[model samples]
Target: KVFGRCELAAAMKRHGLDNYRGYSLGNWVCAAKFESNFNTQATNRNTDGSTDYGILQINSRWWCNDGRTPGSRNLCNIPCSALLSSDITASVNCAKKIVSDGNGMNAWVAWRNRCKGTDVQAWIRGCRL
Candidate 1:
């Protein structure tokens, strides 16, 4: 709830879920904190900038960055709507990559420990109830 409706709404736009769903700033923060403690400074420190690193503990290498100009920073390091993914697989996969990179997904796991894979509606109905 720390953020306004517009921001949260915009953030979840790609998520394809209602803002009123089982949305939890708490879960997000907890996940972020546990994963990287809200530290956006985190980076894979990939000299090539093509690998996973800090805060969100991202692994840019997995994402093609196809259209992005070569050497351009297309990853979440710059921050974008894709920061916390709406696509469950993308989110989990990204996290999995980070964890495998030795960054660990503790917070992300904590947030997801309660819900994952289920449809958004189902997750809300079951968890937010």
Candidate 2:
């Protein structure tokens, strides 16, 4: 995985996610920070018997296929493992689809529960991008 906040911002900006779907770069940066600290290979198991994938922690129950899981909604139609990479293309595209599907970044529980009303400017502070 990459290093710090600046790398995170550069990656996000490289994907053209500065303000997609009315959500700011701060929002995306902050969500990524909380979701996986910019580690694209990050994975977290939930109490509900499913897994969250990549930087955004998208759940297998509704998004990507975990490959071994049965009945994954896989709404993004991408492999769960695809999101867990540093390439950022698959994850970025899938996230765009998610936001366009409505709820914007609020599709992320981390966004709604933490980032929505929180001041996240620091996530992008001094990125020099």
Candidate 3:
């Protein structure tokens, strides 16, 4: 499922991402915009042999277990496939865990390059928060 910007904003806000870990909703939106373009089924295979899945692009190396990451921590205690679902509940929860684990939004390189230190308000602009 590909979400419109506002649609994703609404979803993220509903999931309690607003001001999560001092990162505003715009930050989350900006990260998602660059990470997966709001596509629920997005996936990227890393050169390290791990995969990133879903809108937040949770990684197989440390979060979800893909059964092939080699010593996968499975810290999120979920199958990597769960991130592909359009539901996004699992993805959001896993993202919260990632942030709580002290990685902050820097867990995603896309966020570091595109969202961090930038005024991300535009990412959620015109959305009916």
Candidate 4:
């Protein structure tokens, strides 16, 4: 949603992402930072030939269609591009679904490699929400 870290944290708390459904706001911030820098329109072409989309960098191979991918699980049932928007409702929903499917934050490589085991106090620091 193109937020500064504090703004994003506040929004996330209002949206129930601040420790809701087992995901910490800090982890969300961590993943968002490395994945897309909170840029809604971000997309990355992965080395595996799949594109990562939106602020969460959701993978086309597993989550949603990007129109160019030959076959995909389409788990989120929306175009991957749907995630690339300032209104992050769809993206957050998709991410919740991903976590519910047992992946947790591990679905994002950035989270696994960076947020895990790292101190993430600054991700939500000063937000006080």
Q: Which of the numbered candidates is closest to the native, going by highest lDDT?
A: 3
Q: How does each model score on lDDT? A: 0.39, 0.84, 0.92, 0.83
Question: What does the lDDT read for residue 59 in candidate 1?
Answer: 45
TM-score of each: 0.32, 0.90, 0.96, 0.91
lDDT of 2 by residue, 2-43 (tens): 447888788888898888887888899889888888888899
lDDT (Cα, 0-100) at 105 in candidate 3 = 86
The C-alpha stretches of model 2 lying farther than 4 A from their native spots are none
Clashes per prediction?
Answer: 11, 0, 0, 0
Using lDDT, rank the candidates from best to worst: 3, 2, 4, 1
TM-score between model 2 and native? 0.90
Write one digit per residue (lDDT tens) for candidate 4, span 1-129: 577888777766777777756778898988889998988898989777889999888989989998777666799999987999788887888888887787678878789998987887679987778
Q: Candidate 3 at residue 75, lDDT?
A: 91
Q: Give the per-residue lDDT of model 1 (tens digit) for 1-129.
A: 133323433333344333223444333334444445444443344566454434344545554242333455443233323433333334433444344444333334444664333342432232322
Cα RMSD for predicted model 2: 1.5
RMSD of model 4, in Å?
Answer: 1.4
Q: Give the candidate order by descending TM-score.
A: 3, 4, 2, 1
> What is residue 44's positional error in candidate 1, in angstroms?
3.6
- Least accurate 10 contiguous residues by lDDT in model 2: 63-72
- Those runs of model 1 whose alpha carbons end farther than 4 Å from true positions after fitting are 1-21, 45-50, 64-110, 113-129
